[PDB]
Amino acid sequence: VDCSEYPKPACTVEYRPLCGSDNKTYGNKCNFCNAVVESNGTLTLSHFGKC
Amino acid sequence: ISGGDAIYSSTGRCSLGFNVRSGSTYYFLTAGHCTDGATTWWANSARTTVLGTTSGSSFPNNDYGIVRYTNTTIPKDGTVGGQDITSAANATVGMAVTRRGSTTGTHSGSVTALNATVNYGGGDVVYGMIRTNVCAEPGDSGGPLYSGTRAIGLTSGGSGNCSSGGTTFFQPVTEALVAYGVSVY
After folding, report:
1. Which stretches does DSSP call E strand in chain B?
2. Which family does it belong to (chain B)?
3. Looking at residue A15, which CATH number applies to its domain?
């Protein structure tokens, strides 16, 4: 997953989970990448699927 | 199974929009971004209960898709959860609406604007969307937006969340019904 094309003003809301380094399950890549940007690049991907 | 219930494809999970029909052939509507690249749909995460197969998909530009039921025994309720749906209508600014999705359940709000353009990026732009102050989260895609017994739209996307509040855009259901020549029941 690459978040260079972010942030985005909106995300579709399908469920394909990713697990962030904050131990939070992100609903999809768009949600995850917007969070990475919001954290100013501190949040990273732990693994694919639920945490 | 009814509007708002979970539906699984080979890729992920979305929500059933509305159960519709054409003559004696039953289908269900959902988001186009969910039907895009999906063939078979199941009712459970174990993928043991088949629902049907994708018959149409329109995304981006629009955001709707239709799935033909192949499961002959599963109940196909013309409702959203327990809420009966009897007709479809056009959204209007200030209209009180309700959304049901497989992740967040039922949430209400109002229509704040019409004919909105939403850019999901990478060339995925959708037009003519209904803007609302209703929240939605991953898994809610394709779920119904209704107003009483009236079908209004299908959940497409937005920002924010149900805890802090958000903005969600919906595809007008009337356009989907017309494109496929189906009706709610």
Report:
1. 6-8, 13-15, 19-22, 25-30, 40-42, 50-58, 64-69, 79-80, 83-84, 87-88, 96-101, 105-119, 125-132, 144-147, 150-161, 165-172, 183-184
2. Belongs to the peptidase S1 family.
3. 3.30.60.30
Both ends of chain B: CA-CA distance in Å? 14
Contact flag B119-A9 (C-beta cutoff 8 Å): yes
Resolution in A: 1.6
- Residues with Cβ within 8 Å of B146's Cβ and at least 6 positions away in sequence, in order, are B3, B80, B83, B85, B97, B98, B99, B100, B152
- Residue B71 amino acid letter: N
Distance CA B103, CA A26 (A): 13
Q: Is B22 a catalytic residue?
A: no
Q: What is the CATH number of domain B1-77+173-185?
A: 2.40.10.10
Domain ranges of chain B: 1-77+173-185, 78-172
Are the C-beta atoms of B18 and B144 separated by less than 8 Å? yes
**Residue B119 · residue B68 · CB < 8 Å:** no
Q: Is B60 on the interface with A (CB under 8 A)?
A: no
Tell me the C-alpha distance between B131 and A51, whole Å. Answer: 32
Structure-determination technique:
X-ray
Are residues A13 and B11, on separate chains, in Cβ contact within 8 Å? no
